[PDB]
Amino acid sequence: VCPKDATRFKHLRKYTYNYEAESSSGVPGTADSRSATRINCKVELEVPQLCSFILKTSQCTLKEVYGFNPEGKALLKKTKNSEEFAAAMSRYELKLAIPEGKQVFLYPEKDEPTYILNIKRGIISALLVPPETEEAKQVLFLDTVYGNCSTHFTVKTRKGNVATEISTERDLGQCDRFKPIRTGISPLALIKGMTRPLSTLISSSQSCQYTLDAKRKHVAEAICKEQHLFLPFSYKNKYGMVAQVTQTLKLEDTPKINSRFFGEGTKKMGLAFESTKSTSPPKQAEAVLKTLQELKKLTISEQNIQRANLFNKLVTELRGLSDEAVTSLLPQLIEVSSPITLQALVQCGQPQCSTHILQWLKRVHANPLLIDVVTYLVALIPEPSAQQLREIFNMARDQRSRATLYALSHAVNNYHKTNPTGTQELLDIANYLMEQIQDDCTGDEDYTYLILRVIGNMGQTMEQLTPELKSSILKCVQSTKPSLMIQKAAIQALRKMEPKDKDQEVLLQTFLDDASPGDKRLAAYLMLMRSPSQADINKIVQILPWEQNEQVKNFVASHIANILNSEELDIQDLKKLVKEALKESQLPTVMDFRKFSRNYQLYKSVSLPSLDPASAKIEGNLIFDPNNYLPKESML
Amino acid sequence: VPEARAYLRILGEELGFASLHDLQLLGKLLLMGARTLQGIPQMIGEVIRKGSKNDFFLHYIFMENAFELPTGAGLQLQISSSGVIAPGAKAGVKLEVANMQAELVAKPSVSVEFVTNMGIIIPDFARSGVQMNTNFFHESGLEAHVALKAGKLKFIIPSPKRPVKLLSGGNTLHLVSTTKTEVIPPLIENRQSWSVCKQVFPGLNYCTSGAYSNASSTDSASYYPLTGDTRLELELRPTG
């Protein structure tokens, strides 16, 4: 919706605007000695129709002061990235529409970078001119790169009912985004909550000066100047620190365009800012190395005057850098010095530094006990990161220890909940475990036992991603090669795999198998009773009177008798199936508990007021061959 | 011979397992602890025999509040400032065994510095900022050298080859570019540099000095302690 009061242009017009701006950070007390940068671009505003605009940028030259003339004139040079800079800009064109003149919805093409988008948004906010009004006091609510705004609108010069000179001004301490954007900090610095006080010590206010065409409403020129001042470091409270943003847009020409079509990039976005990283060029890392070398040199030089300073500038650059580059570089840094790298890491509140500690630990050749200790310690930290998982996988491969694998499984579950996406890490570890087990599960009994049970820790994820591993688990369960210990571990790996129709079928096959071991048969029977079916229970009850291993028969019959004894709500449903299976069979009479396996169970149901009944279920498992004076096995 | 193992599950989550083989492994771990222990004394003596330098330098940020705020152009004005401590000390004694020549270093140092920084940044692209930097340093210690030779003993104390700054009150600014960190040269007008030195010894003098620009009468410039690289220092100057 395009109100005519918002018209600041004419349709069928391309307005080519030269963008020229500079940011100059300097001290006025020393002749404004400043770090200044000069941006110059060619801009191509395109207006096939009202409020349906297309933006083509080009000829973007990025120059910055490398020196000052004696009279104070700077010396600007194009930077190394100024070419990739211009390429990045020119290689996109923007399509946008502003319903009502105060509702901005960007539609970029091919997901333009966040920072490029934000620079574009600032340019648009400079471009956006409010709808015309005859009220000089006009102040209203406006969006900007910086969020919402209470912006004042006073017409300086008006011809007829059309304003020719206008000033747009807003104090920057009132617009939505004055909240200090968080940043990584020394996680060990104890000072907190002092950020707001400083904002009081901050001064800033914006003013834009506009020259408008009364005929076609177009902006002849635009001057937007911003000045930020800081109060401390100032005698008399006026010798502080000054900053200024000065950007200008000059209308070189307004070619008329024969166009009536406007595009809308798939990605729909507003004028507001979207979070971004303190990114730095990959090169600078090498400077980090020069710096670390320098410090190592200086301790030999015996000078410590500025070492902490350089450390700070470094960790600053550090926070400018990225993750993968750091880790790739990482080994060299330790090669230089371990303890200093530690000072950096500990003072480094960035997540990657925490993740990279693991890598350090393997570098220093830590003792396995401490490796596993820290492994579990971190593994319980919420919201695991895919990277962190890759490190955990690498460490598990390297040590292949019990604690490492348990921590890996728990972190796997945590991230699985964190990210339902079956990322390539899950596939890689799944393949590695499949290698560690194969179909025969032949291997070191401790090793394969641990592999099986740790896999069970993530059973559901394995189901989701790899059915072939489940098939191999069933193979091993039905395989005679693995020891009964390994077979049982495979059975319990189904903990998180919730046996399905086929899993129940395989369990029934291996259980009703008369030659199957008594302990193995009981384990399969227990896992089958986790969620049994009436047809299954009927078959087992039919086979019960003819089962071998009298101790097995006593155990199973005692279990059934207890199930009938149980009243628990779920066991109420289970007893329906039990009854359905008891019509045409009678149980062996359950004798002996000191020399025959026996089943006992107790439930503790309490009626909590205003809450569902709480039932505590107790299972007493006794395993006795007729030759055991004491239980061969027993689980609490 | 019975084989047994046990494990603990919480919510069904196994919490590690214990094995008899695990007990045997722990036995070998104790044996390996003994094996590592046996050779330690000779190793630790070996470094004294050859000598080395020992450095113990913490660098801790007690105070730091960093953040950033956007800008109208869409760029990001970094803002942050910290107080930091680097309280370490240089050490490490080298012994020339059978030469009876002992070299000893012990000079703890204090680096009480502070920075504030503001920076307009272009992520992955560029930066522009200024760094407000107050400085306080100290060091003290001994450089000693003792040698026994042919029944002739001599304790040697190398003299300072540079001024010994007991105190160092320094303040500086810098203009920092993506590829560079540049100091801001001091004004020469009313550039007050002075020094007063008293004799602790004929070759060593206790020195008090101050170098600063007195621009208080000039507008836009903070008073004499500020607006420029200002140093108030307390030193022992070796005459050479």
Q: What is the DSSP string of A107-126?
A: E-SS---HHHHHHHHHHHHH
Q: Check: CB of residue B128 under 8 Å from CB of residue A37.
A: yes
Residues of chain A contacting B231 with CB distance shorter than 8 Å: none
Q: Chains A, B: CB contacts under 8 A, how many?
A: 242
C-alpha distances in Å from residue A404, one per residue of A167, A373, A400, B17: 65, 9, 7, 13
Residues of chain B contacting A444 with CB distance shorter than 8 Å: none
Cβ–Cβ below 8 Å for A180 and B227: no
Distance CA A94, CA A92 (A): 7
- The answer, for A140 touching chain B at a CB cutoff of 8 Å, is no
Residues of chain B contacting A115 with CB distance shorter than 8 Å: 74, 122-125
Task: Give A148: exposed, middle or buried? Use CB within 10 Å, 0-12, 13-18, 19+.
Answer: middle
- The answer, for A189 touching chain B at a CB cutoff of 8 Å, is yes
Q: Check: CB of residue A140 under 8 Å from CB of residue A150.
A: yes
Cβ–Cβ below 8 Å for B67 and A181: yes
C-alpha distances in Å from residue A6, one per residue of A1, A215, A556, B160: 10, 14, 84, 76
- List the one residue out of A273, A26, A80, A247 whose CA is nearest residue B76: A273
As a whole number of angstroms, the longest Cα–Cα distance in chain A is 114
Cβ–Cβ below 8 Å for B72 and A146: yes
Method: cryo-EM
From the CA of A543, how many Å to the nearest CA of chain B? 31
Give residues with Cβ within 8 angstroms of A17, minimum separation 6. Answer: A42, A43, A44, A45, A249, A250, A251, A252
- The answer, for A298 touching chain B at a CB cutoff of 8 Å, is no
Residues of chain A contacting B176 with CB distance shorter than 8 Å: 35
From the CA of B51, how many Å to the nearest CA of chain A? 15
From the CA of A400, how many Å to the nearest CA of chain B? 14
Q: Check: CB of residue A14 under 8 Å from CB of residue A216.
A: no
Q: Which residue of A has its CA nearest to B118?
A: A25
CA A363, A368, A374, A380 torsion: positive or negative?
positive
C-alpha distances in Å from residue A102, one per residue of A128, A177, A266: 9, 18, 21
Q: Where are the alpha helices (DSSP H) in A479-568?
A: 484-492, 501-512, 518-528, 534-543, 550-565
Q: Check: CB of residue A269 under 8 Å from CB of residue A94.
A: no
Structure tokens at A545: 């009177």
Distance CA A324, CA A450 (A): 32
Cβ–Cβ below 8 Å for B74 and A145: yes
Structure tokens at A612: 């569902």
- The dihedral region occupied by B151, where left means phi > 0, alpha psi between -120 and 50, and beta the remainder, is left
- List the one residue out of A624, A618, A631 whose CA is nearest residue A568: A618
Residue A48: other Cβ atoms inside 10 A: 17
Cβ–Cβ below 8 Å for A308 and B115: no
Secondary structure string (H, E, C) spanning chain B: CCCCEEEEEECCEEEEEEEHHHHHHHHHHHHHHHHHHHHHHHHHHHHHHHCCCEEECCCEEEEEEEEEEECCCCCEEEEEEEEEECCCEEECCEEECCCCEEEEEEEEEEEEEEEEEEEEEECCCEEEEEEEEEEEEEECCEEEEEEEECCEEEEECCCCCCCEEEEEEEEECEEEECCEEEECCCCCCCEEEEEEEEECCCCEEEEEEEEEECCCCCCCCCCCCCCCCEEEEEEEEECC
Distance of CA A179 to the CA centre of its chain: 23
Distance CA B170, CA B133 (A): 8
Task: Give A177: exposed, middle or buried? Use CB within 10 Å, 0-12, 13-18, 19+.
Answer: middle
From the CA of B68, how many Å to the nearest CA of chain A? 5
Distance CA A153, CA A134 (A): 10
Residues pairing with B77 in the sheet = B69, B120
Which residue has tokens 């015996």? A302
Residues of chain B contacting A145 with CB distance shorter than 8 Å: 70-74
Structure tokens at B157: 């104390």
Distance CA B142, CA B137 (A): 17
Distance CA A222, CA A124 (A): 12
Structure tokens at A435: 């290698």
Cβ–Cβ below 8 Å for A241 and B223: no
Among A76, A181, A298, which would you mutate to test the B interface (most chain B Cβ atoms within 10 Å of its Cβ)? Answer: A181
Residues of chain B contacting A85 with CB distance shorter than 8 Å: 125
DSSP A250: E
Query: Which residues between 570 and 629 in chain A have a beta carbon less than 8 angstroms from any beta carbon of chain B?
Result: none
Distance of CA A51 to the CA centre of its chain: 37
Residues of chain B contacting A450 with CB distance shorter than 8 Å: 17
Give me the phi and psi of A415, to 5 degrees please. -70, -40
From the CA of B45, how many Å to the nearest CA of chain A? 23
- The answer, for A188 touching chain B at a CB cutoff of 8 Å, is yes
Cβ–Cβ below 8 Å for B137 and A305: yes
Q: Where are the alpha helices (DSSP H) in A380-423?
A: 386-399, 402-418
Distance CA A633, CA A200 (A): 72
Helix (H) or strand (E) segment spanning residue A373:
helix A368-379
- The answer, for A194 touching chain B at a CB cutoff of 8 Å, is yes
Task: Give B16: exposed, middle or buried? Use CB within 10 Å, 0-12, 13-18, 19+.
Answer: middle
Structure tokens at B165: 């700054």
Give me the phi and psi of A437, to 5 degrees please. -115, -45
Q: Check: CB of residue B207 under 8 Å from CB of residue B197.
A: yes
